[PDB]
């Protein structure tokens, strides 16, 4: 369902515009915080040990 | 001044005489008669307007051909002399 929309409206696009639009829409911060949450998931186990 | 001074501005007819009924009900801009419906092929009549149907029905005029049909039927549509 997501892959249909990218073919519909984001077929003709380049990576500079892609990075600009996701930075302007704020999803990149969400991806960063998800990977960060994985980092403290590992880190808390390390501090326990 | 929506009353008496506004009634002085009224000098442009919305309706004029109609060709089928002679009623002064023919709208000038709509090009349609509001009583008989000219120039539509059917004549305007409504079952809620039963008194208007009584006003414009058959028998309220001359019946220039239909007066004699019963008499010709009674004689059997004979020909000759």
């Amino acid at each position: 369902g997501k892959l249909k929309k990218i073919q519909k409206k984001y077929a003709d696009q380049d990576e500079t515009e892609r990075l600009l639009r996701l930075e302007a829409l704020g999803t990149l911060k969400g991806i960063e915080k998800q990977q960060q949450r994985k980092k403290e998931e590992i880190m808390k186990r390390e501090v326990r040990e | 001044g929506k009353g008496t001074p506004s009634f002085g501005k009224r000098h442009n007819k919305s309706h004029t005489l109609c060709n089928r009924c002679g009623r002064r009900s023919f709208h000038v801009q709509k090009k349609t008669c509001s009583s008989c419906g000219y120039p539509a092929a059917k004549t305007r009549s409504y079952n809620w307007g039963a008194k208007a149907k009584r006003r414009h029905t058959t028998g309220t005029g001359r019946m220039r051909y239909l007066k004699h049909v019963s008499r010709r039927f009674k004689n059997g549509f004979q020909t000759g002399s």
Binding site: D12, Q13, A24 | -
Partner: protein, 246 residues
């Protein structure tokens, strides 16, 4: 509730565009045979003012190749075109301002205007005054060109689409303040009936979603869903963000 003003605009009773003093649709010359196998030369007879349009128009005269007569096309005038200039339209036309080359035959960095979307609709893109399209790249296999639009978007259109080389004349218009409700009146008087604009928050609740209240305020949020229906879409439709960014 009543039917609101933007809901009423689509019937086109009093909201049609005032087109009495307009000189014709400003389209490109049709892509017959000469324009796709060679070129053709026409003449600029006069540059004229179009009612309700910020840009001037150019009346270009060509010869009909199949019949002894003259054809008169209405182009949107590019900045620098003069009367008596020869205009060259075609595949083999030289790269000068005013010429009507197809987009496959112009190099990188070319600035064009009155660009066709698909080959043959006779001008769709960059037609308002001061606007232009930049060619960003070519793609010969699967023959397309990337273009930068006046909105900043990047489109990928066919390389057989045509465009007039240069920028649309009459640029810099909106930099002058109107200063007067009379000037705005005379501006929209030849476009359409969309002026003056009453705020919906100053209405009664029968007339607008924003109307009503003992103080002039909106009530709910003014950002409206894209899935909203007619009569609800009054405000900022499908806004990704709001506010003044710094």
């Amino acid at each position: 509730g009543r039917v609101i003003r933007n809901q009423r605009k689509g019937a086109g009773s009093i909201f049609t565009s005032h087109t009495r003093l307009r000189q014709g649709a400003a389209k490109l010359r049709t892509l017959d045979y000469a324009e796709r196998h060679g070129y053709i030369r026409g003449i600029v007879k006069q540059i004229v003012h179009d009612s309700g349009r910020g840009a001037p128009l150019a009346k270009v005269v060509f010869r009909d190749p199949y019949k002894y007569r003259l054809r008169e096309e209405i182009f949107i005038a590019n900045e620098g075109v003069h009367t008596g200039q020869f205009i060259y339209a075609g595949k083999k036309a030289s790269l000068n301002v005013g010429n009507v080359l197809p987009l496959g035959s112009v190099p990188e960095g070319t600035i064009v205007s009155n660009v066709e979307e698909k080959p043959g609709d006779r001008g769709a893109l960059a037609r308002a005054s001061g606007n232009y399209v930049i060619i960003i790249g070519h793609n010969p296999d699967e023959n397309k060109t990337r273009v930068r639009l006046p909105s900043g978007a990047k489109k990928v259109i066919s390389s057989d689409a045509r465009g007039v080389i240069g920028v649309i004349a009459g640029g810099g218009r909106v930099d002058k303040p109107l200063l007067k409700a009379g000037r705005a009146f005379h501006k929209y008087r030849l476009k359409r009936n969309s002026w003056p604009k009453t705020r919906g928050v100053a209405m009664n609740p029968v007339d607008h979603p924003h109307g009503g209240g003992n103080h002039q305020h909106i009530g709910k949020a003014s950002t409206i869903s894209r899935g909203a229906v007619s009569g609800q879409k009054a405000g900022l439709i499908a806004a990704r963000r709001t506010g003044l960014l710094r």
